[PDB]
Paper text:
A key component of the recycling machinery is the endosomal sorting complex for promoting exit 1 (ESCPE-1), which rescues transmembrane proteins from the endolysosomal pathway for transport to the trans-Golgi network and the plasma membrane. The SNX protein family is defined by the presence of a phox-homology (PX) domain that typically binds phosphatidylinositol phospholipids (PtdInsPs), but may also participate in protein–protein interactions. Herein, we show that ESCPE-1 has a single-layer coat organization and suggest how synergistic interactions between ESCPE-1 protomers, phosphoinositides and cargo molecules result in a global arrangement of amphipathic helices to drive tubule formation.
To understand how coat assembly, cargo sorting and membrane deformation are coordinated, we performed cryo-electron tomography (cryo-ET) on the tubulation reaction mediated by SNX1–SNX5 in the presence of CI-MPR2330–2491, and solved the three-dimensional (3D) structure by subtomogram averaging. Initial subtomogram averaging of short tube segments revealed right-handed helices around the membrane with a different number of helix starts (rows around the axis) depending on the tubes. Following the methodology described in Subtomogram averaging, we characterized the helical behavior of the coating of each filament to perform a particle extraction guided by the lattice geometry determined in each case, leading to two different averages: one average that included the structure of three complete consecutive particles (three-particle average, resolution ~12 Å), and a finer average that included the structure of individual particles (one-particle average, resolution ~10 Å). The SNX1–SNX5 heterodimer forms helical rows that are held together mainly through two intertwined BARtip-to-PX contacts between the edge of one BAR domain and the PX domain of the next heterodimer. The average peripheral membrane diameter was 28 ± 2 nm, which was decorated with a ~3.7-nm-thick protein coat. BARtip-to-BARtip contacts occur between the side-tips of the α2 helices from each BAR domain, resembling an SNX1 coat, whereas BARtip-to-PX contacts involve the tip of the α3 helix from each BAR domain with the start of the amphipathic helix (SAH) in the adjacent molecule.
Residue numbers in the entry:
A (entry chain C): 171 to 180, 191 to 200
B (entry chain B): 29 to 404
C (entry chain A): 142 to 522
């Protein structure tokens, strides 16, 4: 129910964050 | 170089996006030369509203507020994919998931960019870069947005909209006075429709692009699946073409996203920007109607010789208040024109570079595979 | 490996109105002494390939031979070529049909038994003498066609067996699975084609709006740059569409042919089972004959006895024939599966290279298009 995505600039990378 | 602002990351939490606003500065008004704060889309809307409501900035081109982040399309597709996980192969599911993550990331990058561009415009402006509410939203006392617990204030604001919306709707039926605000008006009027039409056509084109990209992944899956049972001679050949379509899918989805960012988003921006310029003309001419209303009041006041000075003064301020708005209006419309030419030029250049990047990437991909088979 | 190559070229519309048809130039090159010339060419209409398949199937399919099927009757493509609308979709249809007729004929001439058939090699030599609007032929061929159809459906619905030995059924499993994987990849490419086409349309729309934007522009430099960008988009939308046709005729249609050939090995296995059944039925008939004699051995009629002893001798021979056909048909499916595999490795690589070169040409075109617009973007002052 609480899927969140992190978008970061180091070039950009997107990370899935899974927290039930 | 004295006030540099970037948005290095953001986090999409449920129905909200949080932006990490990073600031580098040499200005002694800030406590640190480098710092970062978290900000939500509503904080940018508040900053924009406060800058518009500041009377001393009435003659400045306030940058348009960034658009609300819209993830409903990408999120709905991602949910439907999860409900369908049992109806497709693990390879098809993984591919479709990757294409939707790329669509989500394209919308996310366009959103971050639009919010960064808004702050960079404020920092680049010789007056607005010194604004207290701007400095407070950057390197001030943390965040002062939703610090007040009571919603009573929110209820009062919502009511104004039901009453406020009617004034704008009624104002549409009006006739231009004098000789000002003539040809240009119908132009904006005309350009908005051309801008809106090119926006929906752009959106349809990119969404068709992603559809094509999706096929590439689905095709590579059936190719891979097909190559399993088969004589070994052709079995390896088929895996090389499935490997190819797996990569080609990645570039097609990438060209759709960059297309959404450079063209569709550029057109979205100036569709709302035109709307803002139209509100300027509406207010300028409003003064005009006010100046007529005032004269009709002096004409009668002079006959009875009672409140002549009072109605004289009223006429004088709506005459010259019109000129004061008229000056700032023309100063901002011209400002808009100059910024629109720079924006179009910038996106067209960038888009062309990205289109060339992906085209060459596909050529090398297809080239190596073709030269591979020709030289078995 | 026969030193014989067939090519199909030059789709030509012959005649006018309702009697108009498309002929194809069938070119043959061979060193085989069964032909009068080492190189020759004939004109053949699509229905002549159907007539070849009919004659070959009547002679050979009942004996367990895998007779390659011709490409399907596209009614939609026939109407398009007849309505005279010289466009791009008619040329695509004719090229698709030509390519499929060429494969079909290549399969026929690569097969040892069919290459020796007088209708294949020797009918390649017969004046077409096309004529139009003759009802009498429709009246006799047509009456026979409707009655046969009713008989075919009842037999197909009433009885549906499987295989006996793994030779056809183990292998039959592999064949049926590979067809599943080909239809999967094929259905995914058809969506790729449409998607591409759908992309070409949206790019055409976008191209137009850009030109309209350039015209609305009040800045000469921006109108010039925008106008030029539209011309780039205009060229790209053609690449998209031509690529979509290559995705379909050079890839999607390639898969369909293999699915067409696999179904021809499936039909061979099915025909092997039909022969086995007929063989078994003959044995059941023979038992009834032997039992008919046993009953008469106790009777007192020597004439009816010899009657029974003869029908046994006759059906001893018949069951021997059906058994010898089953052996031969079993050899055909083996010969047919090997042919399908060897032809796959011989041609598959080149057909994939042909398609991949089609994507390589596109990208090369993309690069040149944008490399040429780059200097025009920088020239915006």
């Amino acid at each position: 129910s609480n899927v969140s995505y992190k978008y970061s600039k180091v070039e950009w990378l997107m990370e899935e964050i899974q927290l039930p | 170089p004295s006030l540099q602002i970037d948005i290095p990351d953001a986090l999409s939490e449920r129905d909200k996006v949080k932006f990490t606003v990073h600031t580098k500065t040499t200005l002694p008004t800030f406590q640190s030369p480098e710092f970062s704060v978290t900000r939500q889309h509503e904080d940018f809307v508040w900053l924009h509203d406060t800058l518009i409501e500041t009377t001393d900035y009435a003659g400045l081109i306030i940058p348009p507020a960034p658009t609300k982040p819209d993830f409903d399309g990408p999120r709905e597709k991602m949910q439907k994919l999860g409900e369908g996980e049992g109806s497709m192969t693990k390879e098809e599911f993984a591919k479709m998931k990757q294409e939707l993550e790329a669509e989500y990331l394209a919308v996310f990058k366009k959103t971050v960019s639009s919010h960064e561009v808004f702050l960079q415009r404020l920092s680049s402006h010789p007056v607005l870069s010194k604004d207290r509410n701007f400095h407070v939203f950057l390197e001030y006392d943390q965040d002062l947005s939703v610090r007040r617990k009571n919603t009573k204030e929110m209820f009062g604001g919502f009511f104004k909209s039901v009453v406020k919306s009617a004034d704008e709707v009624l104002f549409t039926g009006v006739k231009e006075v004098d000789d000002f605000f003539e040809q240009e008006k119908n132009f904006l009027i005309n350009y908005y429709n051309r801008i809106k039409d090119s926006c929906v056509k752009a959106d349809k084109m990119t969404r068709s692009h992603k559809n094509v990209a999706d096929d590439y992944i689905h095709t590579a899956a059936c190719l891979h699946s097909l190559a399993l049972e088969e004589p070994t001679v052709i079995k390896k050949y088929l895996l090389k073409v499935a490997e190819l379509f797996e990569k080609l899918r990645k570039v097609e989805g990438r060209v759709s996203s960059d297309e959404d960012l450079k063209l569709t988003e550029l057109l979205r921006y100036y569709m709302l920007n035109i709307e803002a310029a139209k509100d300027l003309l509406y207010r300028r001419t409003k003064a005009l109607i006010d100046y007529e209303n005032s004269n009709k009041a002096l004409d009668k006041a002079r006959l009875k010789s009672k409140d002549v000075k009072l109605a004289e003064a009223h006429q004088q301020e709506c005459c010259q208040k019109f000129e004061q708005l008229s000056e700032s209006a023309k100063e901002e419309l011209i400002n808009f024109k100059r910024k629109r030419v720079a924006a179009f030029r910038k996106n067209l250049i960038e888009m062309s570079e990205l289109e060339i990047k992906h085209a060459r990437n596909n050529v090398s991909l297809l080239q190596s595979c073709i030269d591979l088979f020709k030289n078995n | 490996q026969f030193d014989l190559t067939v090519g199909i070229t030059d789709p030509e519309k012959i005649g006018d109105g309702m009697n108009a048809y498309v002929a194809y130039k069938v070119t043959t090159q061979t060193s085989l002494p069964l032909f009068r010339s080492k190189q020759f060419a004939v004109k053949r209409r699509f229905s002549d390939f159907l007539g070849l398949y009919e004659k070959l199937s009547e002679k050979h399919s009942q004996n367990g031979f895998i007779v390659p099927p011709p490409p399907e009757k596209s009614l939609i493509g026939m109407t398009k070529v007849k309505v005279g609308k010289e466009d791009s979709s008619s040329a695509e249809f004719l090229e698709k049909r030509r390519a499929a007729l060429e494969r079909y004929l290549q399969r026929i001439v690569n097969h040892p038994t069919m290459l020796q058939d007088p209708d294949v090699r020797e009918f390649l030599e017969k004046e077409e003498l096309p004529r139009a609007v003759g009802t009498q032929t429709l009246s006799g061929a047509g009456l026979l066609k409707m009655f046969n159809k009713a008989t075919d459906a009842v037999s197909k619905m009433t009885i549906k067996m499987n295989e006996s030995d793994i030779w056809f059924e183990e292998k039959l499993q592999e064949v049926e699975c590979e067809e599943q994987r080909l239809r999967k990849l094929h259905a995914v490419v058809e969506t790729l084609v449409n998607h591409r086409k759908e992309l070409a349309l949206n790019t055409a729309q976008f191209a137009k709006s850009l030109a309209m934007l350039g015209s609305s522009e009040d800045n000469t430099a921006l109108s010039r740059a925008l106008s030029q960008l539209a011309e780039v988009e205009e060229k790209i939308e053609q690449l998209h569409q031509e690529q979509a046709n290559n995705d379909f005729f050079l890839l999607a249609e390639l898969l369909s042919d293999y699915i067409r050939l696999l179904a021809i090995v499936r039909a061979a296995f099915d025909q092997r089972m039909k022969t086995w059944q007929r063989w078994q039925d003959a044995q059941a008939t023979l038992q009834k004959k032997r039992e008919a004699e046993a009953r008469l051995l106790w009777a007192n009629k020597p004439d009816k006895l010899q009657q029974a002893k003869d029908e046994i001798l006759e059906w001893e021979s018949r069951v021997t024939q059906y058994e010898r056909d089953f052996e031969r048909i079993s050899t055909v499916v083996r010969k047919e599966v090997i042919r399908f595999e060897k032809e796959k490795s011989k041609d598959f690589k080149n057909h994939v290279i042909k398609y991949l070169e089609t994507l390589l040409y596109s990208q090369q075109q993309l690069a040149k298009y944008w490399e040429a617009f780059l200097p025009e973007a920088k020239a915006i002052s």
